[PDB]
Design an enzyme around this catalytic site. Sequence first.
Site, mmCIF file in Angstrom:
data_model
loop_
_atom_site.group_PDB
_atom_site.id
_atom_site.type_symbol
_atom_site.label_atom_id
_atom_site.label_comp_id
_atom_site.label_asym_id
_atom_site.label_seq_id
_atom_site.Cartn_x
_atom_site.Cartn_y
_atom_site.Cartn_z
ATOM 1 N N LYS A 162 0.835 -1.198 0.000
ATOM 2 C CA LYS A 162 0.000 0.000 0.000
ATOM 3 C C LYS A 162 0.861 1.236 0.000
ATOM 4 O O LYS A 162 1.757 1.376 0.848
ATOM 5 C CB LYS A 162 -0.891 -0.026 1.253
ATOM 6 N N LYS A 171 -12.860 -8.499 -9.821
ATOM 7 C CA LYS A 171 -13.502 -9.088 -8.636
ATOM 8 C C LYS A 171 -14.700 -9.876 -9.109
ATOM 9 O O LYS A 171 -15.782 -9.341 -9.321
ATOM 10 C CB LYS A 171 -13.986 -8.015 -7.649
#
Length: 321
Positions: free
Chosen positions: A137, A244
């Site tokens: 991140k 997804k």
Amino acid sequence: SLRWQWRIYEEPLQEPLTTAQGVWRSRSGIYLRLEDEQGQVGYGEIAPLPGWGSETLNADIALCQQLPGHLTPEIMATIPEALPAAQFGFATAWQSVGRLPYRVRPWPICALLGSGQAALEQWQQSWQRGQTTFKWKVGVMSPEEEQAILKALLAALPPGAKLRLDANGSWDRATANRWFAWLDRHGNGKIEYVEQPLPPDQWQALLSLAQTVTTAIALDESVVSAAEVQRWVDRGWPGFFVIKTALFGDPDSLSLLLRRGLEPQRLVFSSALEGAIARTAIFHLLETWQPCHALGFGVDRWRSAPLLTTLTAYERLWERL
Ligand code: NA
């Protein structure tokens, strides 16, 4: 036709998940159970993710209450395109009837590295358990601080490591540009892509960056539904798409896109913190799609969902409700 039932679930996360937009403490969704006249059973899961697209669990619930008590392919074709998680749930449930349990396999899984200096101490245990692709991140500390950590991380990772940088749409345009210039100078064969450098609303700049910078870019927040994927293909997106599957629509729509202009090598399949019914359904679909990049399913800290290997395991999950 066949008969069916649905149940809501609301499952606490194993530990809370902090994002820029607030702290997550639970996931909710719907489980579907389908049974034919003989007694064969199938299961599916509908779990839209709050904030990701326009579909809401309340809208999926309304859909479930509006459908007839007996399902057919033509009835399932009436499910609105605006409810892609519902499309996934019903399509996977239908296909599972009399086909459970599914044959699945270990695919390589991407390991997460926390923001900041944490990255430098968190890759080793994952590497030692055979994970060789990582996602770290970024956009949390200053660019210069993250670049210094990145320099150390790239020096420390063993030969063969691959690293994804996930900005989660947190950079402004000038910052993204400075990062890509730094990566051109200081990047490394270990950098696979930068994920979502800009928020989805800045689509023109995202496209222009991908078309001009030397490091690959992946879309994530920008690509939830099949319609969004198709829009980016038709824009000539040259980078990666993080799919997804549980949120995307009928799985057959991804295969159609692939038969057309979408490149299989540009896909990365990832988790929407869905449960074991959806995850097992996705792993079944991966036996067809045969992924070529580490899966974004390294999410056990927040939601553990071991794949279902027996029909009774599905029945236990259902009855537990
Ligand atoms: Na992202």
